[PDB]
Amino acid sequence: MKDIAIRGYCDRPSVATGETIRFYVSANETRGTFDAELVRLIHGDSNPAGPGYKEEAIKSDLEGQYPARFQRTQFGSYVEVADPDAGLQPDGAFSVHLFLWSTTPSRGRQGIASRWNDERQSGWNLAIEDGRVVFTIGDGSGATSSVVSDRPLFQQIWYSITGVYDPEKKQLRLYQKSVVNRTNSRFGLVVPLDSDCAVSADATVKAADSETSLLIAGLGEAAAQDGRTWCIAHYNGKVDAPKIYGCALGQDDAEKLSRGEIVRPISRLAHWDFSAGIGLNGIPTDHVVDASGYGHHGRCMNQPSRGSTGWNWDGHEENFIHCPEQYGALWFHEDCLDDCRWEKDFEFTVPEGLKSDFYAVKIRYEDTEDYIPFFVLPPRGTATAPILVIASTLSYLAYANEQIMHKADIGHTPVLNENDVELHKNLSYYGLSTYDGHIDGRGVQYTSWRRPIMNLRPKHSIWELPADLHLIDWLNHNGFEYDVATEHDLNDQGAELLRRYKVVLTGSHPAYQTWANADAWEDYLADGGRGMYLAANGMYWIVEVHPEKPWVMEVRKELGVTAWEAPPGEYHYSTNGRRGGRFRGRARATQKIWGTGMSSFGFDHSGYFVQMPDSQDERVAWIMEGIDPEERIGDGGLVGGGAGGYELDRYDLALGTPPNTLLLASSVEHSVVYTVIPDDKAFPHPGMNGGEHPFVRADITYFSTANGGGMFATSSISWLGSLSWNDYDNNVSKMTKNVLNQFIKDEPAPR
């Protein structure tokens, strides 16, 4: 079919003047060259009923031909303990104990702990194959020796597994024992569970040096070429405190290990504590500590979930920073990705005479155009405009590589294209999204910029970079001079970024903010700053950018407008130790800063605004200026079919709308598809729907702040998609143009 043959990404989302961005490109097979050139994105939405696709080409020092090639991607979570000297390949006896929690115990061959080679069958591994636990040694001749558990594992049940090799008796052994209590495992203590065993086997071969690294939750593929060990047989579920001894262990000693007790502490070789480094600021590191004192430190790879519930967890503390001794597990999925680790193809250092706007590098392969978007900032410490436009990159990372077709293998018949069929065909090159879930049933918490985000390209509810190019095209079609920042840069710079501008606009779906973004907006509006919020669902989810990996973003979700909920002890972030669920449950609701906040949502079509009795107040005779007081504000539009639809925010004084807020209009004609969000339901009952409940509405509001500041909010997604209707001649664009011409002037906003 129309097969995508070229991919790419940036290392960083936003680049100011005088600093360097890199581009990492991969084709399906290593042949040929590819063209590259820089464009300026103006309007991305290629609906023929609207303005059409627009781009401006820039004569840069970036273009030319570059050799296309293929770049392999590691895909799955593990912990790589690098060992060049084969110190974790003992010669005599050795024993491996770990606590295990398998979430898919029958999905193929799954390696738990290994220092293994799989081209030649050499080394040792402790793996899950055929539903059982198998402990194997090999020497490289193709000859192995395995010991297989009598009792297979259960799904999501804690087990304490010891694997013993003993050269004196020439014998492999294996001690499985299930360690459930009232709270940790899938079912509880009322089962008559007999899943303990103690088996043994004859050893014929020795464990040879595998010439790889030790891996948790995976097997080494071949010997490490150029110091990189690939990983193959990935694992799904928790591993708690693995350890290697340099001695054979009995059954009494494995029984003592099963109760959480470090036996023979001079006979250890390694003991990775997964809860070493938990402070009062979470565990913002990808570093795993050898707790024994032999220096065999590890490194988390592709971001497994730190701060997970461990084997000794009883529900008396549910914040991992206050009981780190019961939170020593990593979750280890098989479909994680924080970085594709490709090689750089070309880099670009931004010139001096380049206007701050939305840019992309258009890459032309044989029969495929590919765009790699990035945002160019103004120079550092300056402001080349009176208007700032916040690009909602944290919600670009939320929906990043969102897979609709892959949700059918775990309304209104969703329309797909050639980008989504590559997301389904190559999961391993792209990753998942926070609206998805892993194959274990847990939602994706971590998401990343350093991967090809296939639904971020400008062409083809839209993919939310075209939905911001709506606003960009409206600003360029009028005579407005604007800058561009991102939510990562607002996180970095605080309100100091915002105070350089007379008015800061908002992207079309700003749903995932950090806590410091909310502080920056609050401190900005509290002293003189103006702002527009031309969107809905605007401060719903709390998000933290990772401190060691700033391209990685963490969210953890709960009951609300969600796709998944966090499991029952794990509501706190790894990156900082704070709660961070949704903003409303922290008493920083969206109404408290921006006037309105999330009220209802649905998926079929849109409505239109009807003028409220505050429309005829003369204090807002500047907003409702060239608009007749009997018209429908926003009937017709590119997104859904109207201006008020698909998500809505409402006026609410009980959540923190300022008392002087005026209520200008509200949206009507919403179907029974739309529903009141679960945040508002005490008892659910029928009639909690659109048209049958008074919380299904958008609300256009204005309020003034101190020192000549103000805030205008329109409370719907499709407001920006309605701006170019009827060739820019409608009530939506006239209202938005009135408020933007008022906000950029050299006088206080009215009261």
């Binding site: 409220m612 505050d614 008392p659 002087n660 005026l662 209520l663 509200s666 029928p686 009639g687 008074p694």
Partner: protein, 119 residues
């Protein structure tokens, strides 16, 4: 500045007035264009082994969520054998009833008359 809580008011109540107006016109159109739901609810006001029509269910979902739903309780003394309709210290009605299905349907009729009286 904002310095006096008497100058400020919940302006959402403007939209509640507008919403209640359009919702009352919708409900009396549904009642006047479907007059068999009254006989239907008179036959079986609980829906016991015969679930309501979507229009009867829509009229229920309008009645069962207003702020005026706090009127019209059904009172029944311990040493009595009839049901009476309380009204808001309530005011008891006068019409006795043998079963409570009759009392619930009379409350349904009186709510339809109340939604007609405001228009």
């Amino acid at each position: 500045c904002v310095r006096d809580p008497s100058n400020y008011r919940d302006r959402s109540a403007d939209w509640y007035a507008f919403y209640d107006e359009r919702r009352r016109k919708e409900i009396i159109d549904i009642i006047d264009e479907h007059p068999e739901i009254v006989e239907e609810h008179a036959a079986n006001p609980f829906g016991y082994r015969k679930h309501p029509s979507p229009y009867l269910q829509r009229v229920h979902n309008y009645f069962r969520m207003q702020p005026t739903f706090g009127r019209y309780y059904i009172y029944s003394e311990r040493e009595w054998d009839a049901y009476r309709i309380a009204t808001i210290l309530p005011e008891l009605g006068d019409e006795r009833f043998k079963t409570e299905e009759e009392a619930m349907h009379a409350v349904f009729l009186r709510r339809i008359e109340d939604v007609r009286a405001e228009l």
